[PDB]
């Protein structure tokens, strides 16, 4: 159930099924990114654990 | 173990502490029920790293507390810089300016000319018969 | 370049107000997101920080904004703290568990979601010291007058004067003209002493 | 086809069968009790 | 999670690495190169 | 410069809570010296017929050692939910949290 996927590869049972579900989730999306001598980092840690990173 | 395995010997050893939360007194899980709080999500021996869990308990478990929060960045360019996105959501706090240095396993290149010089560098010599 | 950032009055103030936000942090059932059509960075040492935190109760997240900036103005002079301070709209002798002028102010956006969109952004100039690092920070929060109040904030914060890093190192071009002309003047003085 | 006509059909047909039917390709949509207790030990669907 | 092999239960000593990084990296001579540059100015002038 | 150094090879149980209320606080009992307490109720122990009964420390010292030493609390005592009485322990709770 992505965006990018095309439909054609799905039934059409799954196709109707694909707008109506919930997600909760933690998502990061880049469409583009070019990088130029850069160091991009794209973390995203999110459920509640322990505050202290090692 | 398959949940079969794990149900039959908790049933067969229903005091014992590491499985505890897989079969919990009622009294728990409604107190749980009562605080809008699951009771897996914060009793003691479900986060016991010995305990057995069966399937249902570990994907209920995995859904505790969890937020929906997401960044959508579109054509993003950067030169010379540095793109941190952090997108949390949680009590953990990203370490900011923590520079992360790891181990530079350099490898030492040696002024070492072509050895294909060596035929041309004999020649040169070989012009002092020029000067004799 | 791994560099260190450059810790800067605005910095100081979001960074506290992130981590008493991630010290409080409850969950909630609200969607927050951040949606940036373009990100263009032209400019070296441009950090760019885009943290996505949001929390629903705005008015602890009002309480906790005004206790970071409180500590944060606890080291300006006492005349520039002050009248920054009337310039936002906070007051020191009020304790930060009340309302104040500008939360009055930023409760105009109560009735819109917790999402940031911006449709482009560019980082400008990021005068640094060397080894050091200007990081820009797109702070999203559980309510948009927390936002308000956010970058009105983080404005008021940068209009004070902070000497910047002047470089005077000059532009590089391939300079063949020196040794030409070097060579020029070898052949003339070989004509002097010959 | 996503009617009420249809998910009614759907269900007459489902429920129109023989046990061993039931007990070989329906065991979702008749769970035992242990399965039952389980569900309500939790809070989304047991489906889930 | 997806980071959690990255980092490490021991406390790190980033000190010690950067010493490391430091021993073991390549050696600009600016001392060697210096006093070549010494003695090929004072021979080209001097000498010569 | 960076953040200090970490040790996760010892567990810290208020590194994993983030709520307040969560987290067991020890704290005075006008009825009988002190007892645990959190929002989930008062650390208890196992009755003759498996009935709920809150400890008693005579002094915080006991408190303190019993509350957040290796053992595990299995027991929880809630006068809110578990007798659903809701007498003066539910409201002296709510005060507490």
Same mark, same amino acid.
């Given at each position: 159930?992505?965006?990018?996927?095309?439909?054609?590869?799905?039934?059409?049972?799954?196709?109707?099924?694909?707008?109506?579900?919930?997600?909760?989730?933690?998502?990061?999306?880049?469409?583009?990114?070019?990088?130029?001598?850069?160091?991009?980092?794209?973390?995203?840690?999110?459920?509640?654990?322990?505050?202290?990173?090692? | 173990?398959?949940?079969?395995?794990?149900?039959?010997?908790?049933?067969?050893?229903?005091?014992?502490?590491?499985?505890?939360?897989?079969?919990?007194?009622?009294?728990?899980?409604?107190?749980?029920?009562?605080?809008?709080?699951?009771?897996?999500?914060?009793?003691?021996?479900?986060?016991?790293?010995?305990?057995?869990?069966?399937?249902?308990?570990?994907?209920?478990?995995?859904?505790?507390?969890?937020?929906?929060?997401?960044?959508?960045?579109?054509?993003?360019?950067?030169?010379?810089?540095?793109?941190?996105?952090?997108?949390?959501?949680?009590?953990?706090?990203?370490?900011?300016?923590?520079?992360?240095?790891?181990?530079?396993?350099?490898?030492?290149?040696?002024?070492?000319?072509?050895?294909?010089?060596?035929?041309?560098?004999?020649?040169?010599?070989?012009?002092?018969?020029?000067?004799? | 370049?791994?560099?260190?950032?450059?810790?800067?009055?605005?910095?100081?103030?979001?960074?506290?107000?992130?981590?008493?936000?991630?010290?409080?942090?409850?969950?909630?059932? /609200? &969607?927050?997101?951040?949606?940036?059509?373009?990100?263009?960075?032209?400019?070296?040492?441009?950090?760019?920080?885009?943290?996505?935190?949001?929390?629903?109760?705005?008015?602890?997240?009002?309480?906790?904004?005004?206790?970071?900036?409180?500590?944060?103005?606890?080291?300006?002079?006492?005349?520039?703290?002050?009248?920054?301070?009337?310039?936002?709209?906070?007051?020191?002798?009020? /304790?930060?568990?009340?309302?104040?002028?500008?939360?009055?102010?930023?409760?105009?956006?109560?009735?819109?979601?917790?999402?940031?969109?911006?449709?482009?952004?560019?980082?400008?100039?990021?005068?640094?010291?060397?080894?050091?690092?200007?990081?820009?920070?797109? /702070?999203?929060?559980?309510?948009?007058?927390?936002?308000?109040?956010?970058? &009105?904030?983080?404005?008021?914060?940068?209009?004070?004067?902070? !000497? !910047?890093?002047?470089?005077?190192?000059?532009?590089?071009?391939?300079?063949?003209?020196?040794?030409?002309?070097?060579?020029?003047?070898?052949?003339?003085?070989?004509?002097?002493?010959? | 086809?996503?009617?009420?006509?249809?998910?009614?059909?759907?269900?007459?047909?489902?429920?129109?069968?023989?046990?061993?039917?039931?007990?070989?390709?329906?065991?979702?949509?008749?769970?035992?009790?242990?399965?039952?207790?389980?569900?309500?030990?939790?809070?989304?669907?047991?489906?889930? | 999670?997806?980071?959690?092999?990255?980092?490490?239960?021991?406390?790190?000593?980033?000190?010690?690495?950067?010493?490391?990084?430091?021993?073991?990296?390549?050696?600009?001579?600016?001392?060697?190169?210096?006093?070549?540059?010494?003695?090929?100015?004072?021979?080209?002038?001097?000498?010569? | 410069?960076?953040?200090?150094?970490?040790?996760?090879? #010892?567990?810290?149980?208020?590194?994993?809570?983030?709520? #307040?209320?969560?987290?067991?606080?020890? #704290?005075?009992?006008?009825?009988?010296?002190?007892?645990?307490?959190?929002?989930?109720?008062?650390?208890?122990? #196992?009755?003759?017929?498996?009935?709920?009964?809150?400890?008693?420390?005579?002094?915080?010292?006991?408190?303190?050692?019993?509350?957040?030493?290796?053992?595990?609390?299995?027991?929880?005592?809630?006068?809110?939910?578990?007798?659903?009485?809701?007498?003066?322990?539910?409201?002296?709770?709510?005060?507490?949290?």
């Amino acid at each position: 159930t992505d965006e990018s996927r095309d439909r054609k590869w799905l039934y059409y049972n799954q196709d109707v099924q694909r707008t109506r579900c919930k997600y909760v989730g933690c998502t990061i999306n880049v469409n583009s990114l070019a990088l130029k001598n850069s160091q991009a980092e794209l973390t995203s840690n999110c459920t509640r654990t322990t505050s202290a990173v090692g | 173990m398959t949940d079969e395995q794990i149900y039959a010997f908790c049933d067969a050893n229903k005091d014992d502490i590491r499985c505890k939360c897989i079969y919990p007194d009622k009294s728990i899980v409604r107190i749980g029920i009562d605080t809008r709080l699951p009771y897996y999500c914060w009793y003691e021996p479900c986060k016991r790293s010995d305990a057995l869990l069966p399937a249902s308990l570990k994907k209920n478990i995995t859904k505790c507390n969890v937020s929906d929060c997401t960044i959508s960045l579109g054509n993003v360019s950067i030169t010379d810089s540095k793109l941190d996105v952090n997108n949390v959501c949680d009590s953990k706090r990203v370490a900011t300016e923590n520079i992360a240095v790891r181990y530079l396993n350099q490898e030492i290149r040696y002024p070492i000319i072509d050895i294909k010089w060596l035929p041309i560098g004999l020649l040169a010599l070989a012009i002092l018969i020029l000067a004799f | 370049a791994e560099t260190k950032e450059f810790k800067t009055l605005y910095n100081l103030f979001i960074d506290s107000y992130l981590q008493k936000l991630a010290q409080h942090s409850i969950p909630t059932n /609200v &969607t927050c997101a951040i949606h940036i059509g373009e990100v263009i960075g032209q400019f070296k040492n441009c950090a760019l920080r885009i943290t996505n935190k949001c929390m629903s109760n705005s008015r602890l997240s009002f309480t906790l904004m005004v206790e970071s900036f409180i500590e944060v103005i606890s080291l300006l002079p006492e005349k520039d703290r002050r009248r920054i301070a009337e310039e936002i709209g906070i007051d020191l002798d009020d /304790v930060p568990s009340a309302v104040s002028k500008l939360e009055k102010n930023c409760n105009a956006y109560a009735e819109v979601n917790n999402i940031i969109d911006i449709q482009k952004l560019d980082i400008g100039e990021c005068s640094a010291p060397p080894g050091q690092h200007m990081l820009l920070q797109i /702070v999203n929060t559980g309510s948009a007058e927390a936002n308000c109040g956010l970058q &009105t904030i983080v404005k008021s914060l940068n209009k004070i004067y902070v !000497p !910047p890093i002047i470089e005077n190192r000059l532009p590089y071009y391939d300079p063949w003209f020196l040794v030409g002309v070097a060579i020029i003047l070898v052949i003339f003085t070989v004509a002097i002493c010959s | 086809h996503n009617t009420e006509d249809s998910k009614e059909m759907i269900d007459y047909i489902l429920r129109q069968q023989s046990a061993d039917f039931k007990q070989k390709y329906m065991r979702c949509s008749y769970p035992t009790r242990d399965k039952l207790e389980e569900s309500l030990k939790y809070a989304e669907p047991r489906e889930c | 999670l997806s980071n959690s092999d990255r980092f490490s239960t021991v406390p790190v000593n980033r000190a010690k690495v950067v010493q490391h990084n430091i021993k073991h990296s390549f050696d600009l001579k600016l001392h060697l190169i210096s006093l070549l540059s010494l003695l090929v100015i004072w021979i080209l002038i001097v000498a010569i | 410069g960076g953040t200090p150094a970490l040790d996760r090879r #010892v567990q810290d149980v208020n590194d994993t809570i983030s709520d #307040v209320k969560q987290k067991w606080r020890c #704290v005075v009992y006008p009825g009988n010296g002190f007892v645990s307490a959190s929002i989930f109720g008062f650390q208890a122990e #196992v009755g003759p017929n498996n009935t709920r009964s809150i400890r008693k420390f005579n002094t915080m010292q006991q408190c303190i050692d019993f509350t957040f030493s290796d053992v595990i609390n299995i027991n929880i005592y809630n006068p809110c939910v578990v007798p659903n009485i809701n007498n003066a322990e539910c409201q002296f709770l709510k005060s507490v949290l």
